[PDB]
Design a protein around this motif. Sequence first.
Motif, PDB file in Angstrom:
ATOM      1  N   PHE A 137      50.823  59.380  39.502  1.00  0.00           N
ATOM      2  CA  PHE A 137      50.342  58.049  39.837  1.00  0.00           C
ATOM      3  C   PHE A 137      50.506  57.033  38.716  1.00  0.00           C
ATOM      4  O   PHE A 137      50.680  57.384  37.543  1.00  0.00           O
ATOM      5  CB  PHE A 137      48.857  58.105  40.223  1.00  0.00           C
ATOM      6  N   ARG A 138      50.458  55.763  39.105  1.00  0.00           N
ATOM      7  CA  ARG A 138      50.392  54.658  38.157  1.00  0.00           C
ATOM      8  C   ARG A 138      49.593  53.533  38.799  1.00  0.00           C
ATOM      9  O   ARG A 138      49.398  53.515  40.016  1.00  0.00           O
ATOM     10  CB  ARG A 138      51.795  54.161  37.779  1.00  0.00           C
ATOM     11  N   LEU A 139      49.126  52.591  37.994  1.00  0.00           N
ATOM     12  CA  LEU A 139      48.479  51.403  38.536  1.00  0.00           C
ATOM     13  C   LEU A 139      49.523  50.400  39.030  1.00  0.00           C
ATOM     14  O   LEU A 139      50.653  50.359  38.530  1.00  0.00           O
ATOM     15  CB  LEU A 139      47.588  50.746  37.482  1.00  0.00           C
ATOM     16  N   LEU A 140      49.156  49.593  40.015  1.00  0.00           N
ATOM     17  CA  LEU A 140      50.038  48.490  40.384  1.00  0.00           C
ATOM     18  C   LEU A 140      50.125  47.532  39.192  1.00  0.00           C
ATOM     19  O   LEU A 140      49.116  47.256  38.538  1.00  0.00           O
ATOM     20  CB  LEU A 140      49.533  47.756  41.626  1.00  0.00           C
ATOM     21  N   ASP A 141      51.325  47.030  38.914  1.00  0.00           N
ATOM     22  CA  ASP A 141      51.556  46.193  37.741  1.00  0.00           C
ATOM     23  C   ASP A 141      52.276  44.941  38.219  1.00  0.00           C
ATOM     24  O   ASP A 141      53.411  45.029  38.667  1.00  0.00           O
ATOM     25  CB  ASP A 141      52.392  46.981  36.722  1.00  0.00           C
ATOM     26  N   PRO A 142      51.643  43.761  38.083  1.00  0.00           N
ATOM     27  CA  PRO A 142      50.406  43.478  37.340  1.00  0.00           C
ATOM     28  C   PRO A 142      49.059  43.674  38.050  1.00  0.00           C
ATOM     29  O   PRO A 142      48.066  43.778  37.339  1.00  0.00           O
ATOM     30  CB  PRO A 142      50.553  41.991  37.021  1.00  0.00           C
ATOM     31  N   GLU A 143      49.014  43.710  39.380  1.00  0.00           N
ATOM     32  CA  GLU A 143      47.746  43.565  40.116  1.00  0.00           C
ATOM     33  C   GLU A 143      46.654  44.604  39.824  1.00  0.00           C
ATOM     34  O   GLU A 143      45.486  44.249  39.613  1.00  0.00           O
ATOM     35  CB  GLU A 143      47.997  43.504  41.629  1.00  0.00           C
ATOM     36  N   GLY A 144      47.024  45.880  39.840  1.00  0.00           N
ATOM     37  CA  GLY A 144      46.064  46.948  39.644  1.00  0.00           C
ATOM     38  C   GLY A 144      45.563  46.923  38.216  1.00  0.00           C
ATOM     39  O   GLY A 144      44.365  47.080  37.972  1.00  0.00           O
ATOM     40  N   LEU A 145      46.483  46.720  37.274  1.00  0.00           N
ATOM     41  CA  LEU A 145      46.121  46.595  35.865  1.00  0.00           C
ATOM     42  C   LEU A 145      45.121  45.455  35.670  1.00  0.00           C
ATOM     43  O   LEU A 145      44.125  45.615  34.968  1.00  0.00           O
ATOM     44  CB  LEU A 145      47.365  46.346  35.005  1.00  0.00           C
ATOM     45  N   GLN A 146      45.391  44.311  36.296  1.00  0.00           N
ATOM     46  CA  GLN A 146      44.486  43.165  36.241  1.00  0.00           C
ATOM     47  C   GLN A 146      43.086  43.514  36.736  1.00  0.00           C
ATOM     48  O   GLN A 146      42.077  43.199  36.087  1.00  0.00           O
ATOM     49  CB  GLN A 146      45.021  42.022  37.092  1.00  0.00           C
ATOM     50  N   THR A 147      43.027  44.157  37.899  1.00  0.00           N
ATOM     51  CA  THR A 147      41.750  44.565  38.483  1.00  0.00           C
ATOM     52  C   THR A 147      40.921  45.448  37.549  1.00  0.00           C
ATOM     53  O   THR A 147      39.739  45.199  37.357  1.00  0.00           O
ATOM     54  CB  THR A 147      41.945  45.260  39.849  1.00  0.00           C
ATOM     55  N   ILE A 148      41.541  46.464  36.956  1.00  0.00           N
ATOM     56  CA  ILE A 148      40.815  47.362  36.060  1.00  0.00           C
ATOM     57  C   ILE A 148      40.436  46.692  34.730  1.00  0.00           C
ATOM     58  O   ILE A 148      39.315  46.868  34.242  1.00  0.00           O
ATOM     59  CB  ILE A 148      41.577  48.686  35.828  1.00  0.00           C
ATOM     60  N   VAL A 149      41.359  45.919  34.156  1.00  0.00           N
ATOM     61  CA  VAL A 149      41.064  45.155  32.937  1.00  0.00           C
ATOM     62  C   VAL A 149      39.819  44.273  33.118  1.00  0.00           C
ATOM     63  O   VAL A 149      38.953  44.202  32.239  1.00  0.00           O
ATOM     64  CB  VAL A 149      42.272  44.293  32.485  1.00  0.00           C
ATOM     65  N   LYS A 150      39.723  43.626  34.276  1.00  0.00           N
ATOM     66  CA  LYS A 150      38.602  42.729  34.579  1.00  0.00           C
ATOM     67  C   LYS A 150      37.308  43.423  35.009  1.00  0.00           C
ATOM     68  O   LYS A 150      36.238  42.804  35.029  1.00  0.00           O
ATOM     69  CB  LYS A 150      39.009  41.750  35.677  1.00  0.00           C
ATOM     70  N   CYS A 151      37.403  44.699  35.366  1.00  0.00           N
ATOM     71  CA  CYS A 151      36.278  45.400  35.964  1.00  0.00           C
ATOM     72  C   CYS A 151      35.120  45.657  35.000  1.00  0.00           C
ATOM     73  O   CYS A 151      35.279  46.353  34.001  1.00  0.00           O
ATOM     74  CB  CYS A 151      36.740  46.725  36.567  1.00  0.00           C
ATOM     75  N   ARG A 152      33.947  45.115  35.312  1.00  0.00           N
ATOM     76  CA  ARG A 152      32.757  45.390  34.511  1.00  0.00           C
ATOM     77  C   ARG A 152      31.657  46.050  35.339  1.00  0.00           C
ATOM     78  O   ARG A 152      30.479  45.976  34.997  1.00  0.00           O
ATOM     79  CB  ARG A 152      32.248  44.125  33.816  1.00  0.00           C
ATOM     80  N   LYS A 153      32.059  46.708  36.422  1.00  0.00           N
ATOM     81  CA  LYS A 153      31.119  47.405  37.296  1.00  0.00           C
ATOM     82  C   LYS A 153      30.501  48.619  36.609  1.00  0.00           C
ATOM     83  O   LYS A 153      31.181  49.347  35.892  1.00  0.00           O
ATOM     84  CB  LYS A 153      31.820  47.829  38.589  1.00  0.00           C
ATOM     85  N   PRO A 154      29.196  48.841  36.824  1.00  0.00           N
ATOM     86  CA  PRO A 154      28.520  49.996  36.230  1.00  0.00           C
ATOM     87  C   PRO A 154      28.734  51.256  37.060  1.00  0.00           C
ATOM     88  O   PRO A 154      29.168  51.167  38.207  1.00  0.00           O
ATOM     89  CB  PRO A 154      27.055  49.588  36.296  1.00  0.00           C
ATOM     90  N   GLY A 155      28.422  52.412  36.487  1.00  0.00           N
ATOM     91  CA  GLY A 155      28.546  53.674  37.192  1.00  0.00           C
ATOM     92  C   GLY A 155      29.941  54.221  37.009  1.00  0.00           C
ATOM     93  O   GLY A 155      30.916  53.468  37.044  1.00  0.00           O
ATOM     94  N   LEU A 156      30.061  55.525  36.801  1.00  0.00           N
ATOM     95  CA  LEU A 156      31.397  56.069  36.581  1.00  0.00           C
ATOM     96  C   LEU A 156      32.124  56.502  37.863  1.00  0.00           C
ATOM     97  O   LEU A 156      33.256  56.961  37.803  1.00  0.00           O
ATOM     98  CB  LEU A 156      31.415  57.160  35.491  1.00  0.00           C
ATOM     99  N   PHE A 157      31.485  56.339  39.017  1.00  0.00           N
ATOM    100  CA  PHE A 157      32.137  56.664  40.285  1.00  0.00           C
ATOM    101  C   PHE A 157      32.330  55.430  41.167  1.00  0.00           C
ATOM    102  O   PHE A 157      32.612  55.549  42.363  1.00  0.00           O
ATOM    103  CB  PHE A 157      31.342  57.722  41.055  1.00  0.00           C
ATOM    104  N   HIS A 158      32.176  54.250  40.575  1.00  0.00           N
ATOM    105  CA  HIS A 158      32.178  53.017  41.353  1.00  0.00           C
ATOM    106  C   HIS A 158      33.540  52.779  41.992  1.00  0.00           C
ATOM    107  O   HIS A 158      34.570  53.056  41.386  1.00  0.00           O
ATOM    108  CB  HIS A 158      31.750  51.822  40.493  1.00  0.00           C
ATOM    109  N   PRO A 159      33.547  52.287  43.235  1.00  0.00           N
ATOM    110  CA  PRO A 159      34.807  52.042  43.939  1.00  0.00           C
ATOM    111  C   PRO A 159      35.485  50.778  43.430  1.00  0.00           C
ATOM    112  O   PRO A 159      34.868  49.970  42.737  1.00  0.00           O
ATOM    113  CB  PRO A 159      34.356  51.847  45.385  1.00  0.00           C
TER     114      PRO A 159
END
Length: 188
Positions: A137-159
Amino acid sequence: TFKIHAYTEGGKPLRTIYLPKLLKKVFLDVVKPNTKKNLETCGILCGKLRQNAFFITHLVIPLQEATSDTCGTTDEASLFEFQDKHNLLTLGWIHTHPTQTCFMSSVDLHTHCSYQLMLPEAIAIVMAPSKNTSGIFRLLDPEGLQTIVKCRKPGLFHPHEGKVYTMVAQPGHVREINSKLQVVDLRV
Ligand SMILES: [Zn+2]
Ligand SMILES: [Zn+2]
């Protein structure tokens, strides 16, 4: 030189990664004692850049903290020193889901983001031995990378929302060949 056979969602080139055909099987064998206890293990995919393609030459098992849902590296100094001494690039990583299906978890996505920012070609191999399945697997680039870079959601199983990751192109991005592999274990 080796030519480009795969492109990101943003239309940027992805150099080929040559993956030894034995790597997945050997990795599973090495980490089997953990797998049997329902514990994840990871390995780092290490290698060289040659004529515009990457070649995985080493499977390095780092110091790490085994749990049923995670396998984060602990003290990276020995990993960095080994790669430094042997002039090895980090090309990706491999890990097990001992009992679950083959997918990228929330933690896997956050982990992989840093790999793929460092090297656009970086890959995440996931083995699901109780299902006899695997995926690369890989992240979508740029979109998926952007989403994870920006993600500040708590919990280690968060969707996560939307299309974040995908399977890599084979053989366009990752191609398997009959090459040599050194297996290096940095654990105690
Ligand atoms: Zn995982
Ligand atoms: Zn997240």
